[PDB]
Amino acid sequence: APVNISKAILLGVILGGLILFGVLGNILVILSVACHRHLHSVTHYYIVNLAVADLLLTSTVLPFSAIFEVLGYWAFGRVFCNIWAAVDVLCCTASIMGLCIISIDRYIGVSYPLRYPTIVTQRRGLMALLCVWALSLVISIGPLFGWRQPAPEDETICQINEEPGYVLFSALGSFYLPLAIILVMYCRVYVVAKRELLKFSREKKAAKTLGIVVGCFVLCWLPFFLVMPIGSFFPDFKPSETVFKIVFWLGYLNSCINPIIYPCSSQEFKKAFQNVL
Numbered sequence: 543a544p545v546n547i548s549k550a551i552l553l554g555v556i557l558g559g560l561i562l563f564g565v566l567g568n569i570l571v572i573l574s575v576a577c578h579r580h581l582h583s584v585t586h587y588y589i590v591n592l593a594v595a596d597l598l599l600t601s602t603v604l605p606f607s608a609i610f611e612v613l614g615y616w617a618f619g620r621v622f623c624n625i626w627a628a629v630d631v632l633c634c635t636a637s638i639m640g641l642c643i644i645s646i647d648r649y650i651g652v653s654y655p656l657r658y659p660t661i662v663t664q665r666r667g668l669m670a671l672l673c674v675w676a677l678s679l680v681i682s683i684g685p686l687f688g689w690r691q692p693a694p695e696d697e698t699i700c701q702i703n704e705e706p707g708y709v710l711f712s713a714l715g716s717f718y719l720p721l722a723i724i725l726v727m728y729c730r731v732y733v734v735a736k737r738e739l740l741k742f743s744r745e746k747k748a749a750k751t752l753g754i755v756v757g758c759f760v761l762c763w764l765p766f767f768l769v770m771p772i773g774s775f776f777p778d779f780k781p782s783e784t785v786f787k788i789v790f791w792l793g794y795l796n797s798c799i800n801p802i803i804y805p806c807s808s809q810e811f812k813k814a815f816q817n818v819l
């Protein structure tokens with residue numbers, strides 16, 4: 543079923559423009575931190591980590607996914623699809639884990655604004671960063687490696703694991719369990735901010751910025767992680783393919799958007815972006 547080139551050209555151009563916007567935003571978010579030595583810290587390094595996760599999503603996953611969508615079939619080989627799926631599942635996991643370890647950074651930095659640089663330093667936060675990378679890698683490849691469904695005969699048919707056994711714990715350990723550690727850390731941050739100086743004000747401003755980021759991420763991803771398990775349990779209530787398309791693309795455009803939040807929310811990042819431009 544060769545889709546008309548003219549009809550799908552609009553979709554292809556839209557997806558390409560979104561991917562380029564996300565990529566440029568992600569390089570900008572990293573370049574602002576790197577060039578400016580007035581804007582480096584454990585939380586800023588974690589923001590750069592999230593930017594790198596978005597870069598991995600938008601430089602190795604999006605282009606291929608958009609090509610697959612517009613074409614409608616997987617031109618490349620089986621091994622290439624297997625690596626692409628693993629890269630996707632691990633980059634999303636890396637982004638969410640970065641979020642959940644930014645949720646602890648901004649809980650420590652709000653509960654103890656003055657003693658904060660003592661609990662976490664450039665040597666202690668990096669251990670957590672590497673640990674979360676390792677955890678994301680093992681919880682991403684593991685489900686794929688451990689619970690792969692049999693390889694399809696056709697090279698142009700390569701879709702996600704329909705088996706509930708995988709999807710259940712993959713989603714749970716990739717989104718829901720990391721999401722609990724975010725919703726509890728930010729609940730504590732909010733209650734602390736309400737009940738509760740210059741350092742405290744800066745910490746609360748950074749907490750609010752990262753809270754906007756976390757909210758956007760969670761709201762955008764929740765449709766997919768709520769529909770796919772529901773479809774797994776409830777095959778009778780699986781939505782239309784359009785629903786799947788829109789939810790996946792929302793889960794991607796969230797990473798595409800992520801860069802915009804920093805300039806619009808935090809004035810410091812706004813100056814950094816202006817200087818870099």
Ligand SMILES: C[C@H](Cc1cc2c(c(C(N)=O)c1)N(CCCO)CC2)NCCOc1ccccc1OCC(F)(F)F
Binds near residue numbers: 608610635787791
């Ligand atoms: C799931 C998705 C991959 C994907 C799948 C399919 C596409 C596309 C596309 N738009 O190119 C992308 N289709 C295109 C239409 C064909 O004609 C048909 C099917 N990656 C997002 C992120 O996934 C997880 C990231 C982290 C944890 C769980 C995830 O869930 C995977 C699941 F198996 F659990 F659902």
